[PDB]
Amino acid sequence: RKKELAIALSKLKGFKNPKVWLEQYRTPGNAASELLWLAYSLGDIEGKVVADLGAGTGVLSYGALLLGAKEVICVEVDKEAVDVLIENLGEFKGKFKVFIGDVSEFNSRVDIVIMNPPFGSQRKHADRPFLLKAFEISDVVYSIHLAKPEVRRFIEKFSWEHGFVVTHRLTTKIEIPHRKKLERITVDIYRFSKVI
Ligand SMILES: Nc1ncnc2c1ncn2[C@@H]1O[C@H](CSCC[C@H](N)C(=O)O)[C@@H](O)[C@H]1O
């Protein structure tokens, strides 16, 4: 929960011109900190090859590198987001790679997946391609989703059908912001582990 990490993550540049249909909002520092600290504390970051699905501006990627990831592979469909991503990860040059294309087209096996995927509120089931890919390329997955009864039921069922079990689920409220009001939603930060 390191508030220092959250603070440092909040200093990164955001999206130039957010495409709402792609749910482009930078992962809030607090939620990002929670997910990363949890993964770090369980030994799922340091020295690991990490894939950041829907990397966007690179908040999760930066935090992972900051916490000792051996390397991070940033998967993002929008080039304009990658421009910001590259600048944000400037101090970790050579330690990250970028895959510009749809998440479903990426297929490199990694040690860990971390992601703040679209919840699927702008486009039906937009989050499924991310969960499917994450389950496909890794044995440990960290993701964020809407803390709603229907969503929770689905996530639990979907991961199971794909051979994964939820080992941790942390619930927090995030605020998605010239200068005005926040959209305050409650999300669950999940940690999935491949059965046996
Ligand atoms: N089909 C798809 N394939 C790959 N990336 C996608 C996608 N649909 C949406 N995205 C990307 O998913 C990202 C997640 S939203 C927030 C990312 C956040 N800035 C962070 O630092 O983690 C968006 O930036 C968006 O462009």
SS3 of 108-134: CCCCEEEECCCCCCCCCCCCHHHHHHH
Residue with CA closest to ligand 1 atom 17: 56
Give domain limits for the chain. Answer: 1-196
Q: Is 166 annotated as a binding residue?
A: no
Q: Is 122 annotated as a binding residue?
A: no
Contacts 24+ apart (CB under 8 A), 8-11: 8/66, 9/33, 9/59, 9/62, 9/63
- Please report the atom of ligand 1 found closest to the CA of residue 56: 24
Q: Find out whether 103 is annotated in a ligand binding site.
A: yes
Please tell me the residue having the least CA distance from ligand 1 atom 24: 56
Please work out whether the CB of residue 103 comes within 6 Å of at least one atom of ligand 1. Answer: yes
* CA–CA separation, 82 and 38 (whole Å): 26
Q: At what angle do helices 128-137 and 149-161 cross, to 10 degrees?
A: 40
Distance 103 CA to ligand 1 centre (A): 9
Q: Does residue 146 contact residue 173 with C-beta atoms inside 8 Å? A: no
Beta-bridged to residue 183, according to DSSP, are 176
Alpha helices in 42-139 (DSSP H): 59-66, 79-88, 128-137
How is residue 31 annotated by DSSP?
Answer: H
> What is the structure's resolution, reported in angstroms to one decimal?
2.2
Architecture of domain 1-196: 3-Layer(aba) Sandwich (3.40)
Q: From which experimental method does this structure derive?
A: X-ray
Give the residue whose CA is nearest to atom 19 of ligand 1: 26
Strands 183-194 vs 164-176: parallel, antiparallel or unpaired:
antiparallel
* C-alpha to C-alpha distance for 110 and 69, rounded to whole angstroms: 12
2 neighbors 111 (Cβ within 8 angstroms): no
Contact (Cβ atoms closer than 8 angstroms) between residue 58 and residue 15? no
Residue 72 corresponds to which amino acid? V
